[PDB]
Structures are given as C-alpha cells and as structure tokens.
C-alpha cells in the first residue's frame, strides 16, 4: 500500500499538492546533482556537427560513439585516459540492470557487480579533473 503525501513547493509563497511518495523520493534523488549524473549519448550526425564548434570534442565524441558509451561531458574531456575504465563501467552497469530486471517480484537484493569502476559510487567517487581551459600555443609562430 502506497500512502498519499503532501508535496509543497516555494519558500515564502508555498503551493501544496498531493503526490506519490515514491515519485517525490525520485525527484529529490535527481536533485542530488553530485550523485545522480546526466550522461550524453551521441549519434554520428550529431558528432559531425560538433566539429563545427570544437574540433577536439569531435574527436573525443567520436571515440564515445564508436564504443556506444553514455558519458558525462567532463569525463569526455579525458576519454583518452578513462576509456579502459569506461568500457569496464559499461559492462558492470549492464550486468546490474540484467540482474535486477530479471529478479522475481518482491526480490530486492542488491545486484552483484564491481562497483570500483562505476562513478559516482561509494567504492569510487571519481577523479579530481584539472581544468583544460588554458592555452598551449604561442600566438607568434
């Protein structure tokens, strides 16, 4: 049985509605921007258009497309180094999805997978990526 809950929005001017408690839990979970992360999936046509604005991203985006990776943009800037982990991450996520989906109803046991390669997770919280927004070339050449 799922009880109904009051959901309120706004700080000084507050609007209240009835909502699903599970939906609200998902809503607040997706607000944890550091934990739940949006990831980008490319297609060949879009990758080509990227080159019109950033040649380096086009090459890195092509690598992600060729491996069918859903990748965060910040990670994409380091896809040259992160590729072996990203491929391992892709397999582990797929394994977890298969196990949970295939489990019988009422079976809420955690999936068995290698969390050390999945980011962000408690086992691996990610790397401190340095900013790449610095120039390397000499204007007079």
């Amino acid at each position: 049985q799922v009880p109904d809950v009051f959901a309120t929005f706004g700080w000084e001017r507050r609007l209240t509605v009835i909502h699903h408690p599970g939906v609200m839990a998902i809503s607040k979970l997706l607000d944890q921007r550091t934990v739940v992360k949006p990831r980008a999936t490319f297609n060949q046509e879009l990758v080509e258009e990227i080159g019109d604005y950033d040649e380096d991203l086009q090459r890195k985006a092509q690598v992600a497309l060729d491996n069918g990776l859903a990748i965060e943009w910040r990670v994409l800037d380091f896809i040259d180094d992160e590729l072996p982990r990203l491929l391992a991450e892709k397999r582990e996520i797929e394994k977890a999805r298969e196990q949970v989906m295939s489990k019988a109803p009422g079976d809420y046991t955690q999936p068995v997978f290698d969390s050390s390669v999945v980011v962000p997770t408690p086992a691996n919280l990610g790397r401190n990526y340095p900013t790449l927004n610095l120039p390397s070339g000499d204007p007079t050449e």
Partner: protein, 141 residues
Amino acid sequence: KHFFTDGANDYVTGWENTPPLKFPASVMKPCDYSMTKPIPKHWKLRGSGIHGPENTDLMKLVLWNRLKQKRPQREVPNINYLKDSIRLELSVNWWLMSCIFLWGPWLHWGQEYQKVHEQPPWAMKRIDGLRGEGYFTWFLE
C-alpha cells in the same frame, strides 16, 4: 515582442493558460471540463464545486507554471519566432543601409547639378528671373 501583454506576451511572470503539447493527455491536459457527462443523481457533492485547484487540471496548470521556471537547458524556438523578436531591429538596420546607399547618392547628385544649373535636376527651370535653388520635392508643387 517588445510590449507586455498579460494574455500572449507575458514575460514578467511566464504564465501560460495551457500546458505544452508535448505532454500526453493522460499526464496533463488543458483545463476543459465543458464536456463532462451528466452527474448521476445518486452521486453526492463532496467538494465545493467551485472552479479552482480542486479540479485536477487547474492544479496541474498552477503547479507546472511554477515548476517550469527551472529547466536544465533552453527550449530553442524556431527561426520564425527569432525573426519576429527582432523584426523592428532588423528593419531599422536595413533602413539605415537604404539611407546611406540609395538616398545619399542621388541627394549628392542633385546638389552637384544644382550648383551648375541653379536648380535641382528634377525641377523645371524658371524663366522669371528669380534667383535661387527653388523647390526640392517637385510633386508637392
């Protein structure tokens, strides 16, 4: 558009009378209960019956109009909208071009002709002995 209108060009609050067409009717629909079938006599009025947030569609309209104000990315309009937004700006710019490249040349030509022939090239020459340039806009004579 420049001018603010509560009904259509309401950029101060962003209120919209109807939800986006993207949502399925099941998720959200315009607030229209004009077609409601007759109420059975054995049904009893529990709520006020007053038009307001007790109706599901109006509640969802109010909720969406507040929660739409934060979005991850821009909702890109089509080029027709973008043209209309700066219609006056673009047209004034072309008017400036017309003044420089159309009006200027023939106005300069008329003054040079006037120097030699005492009257603009688009005017009948006088025989009455009066001196001076005379009229400029011939069709208003």
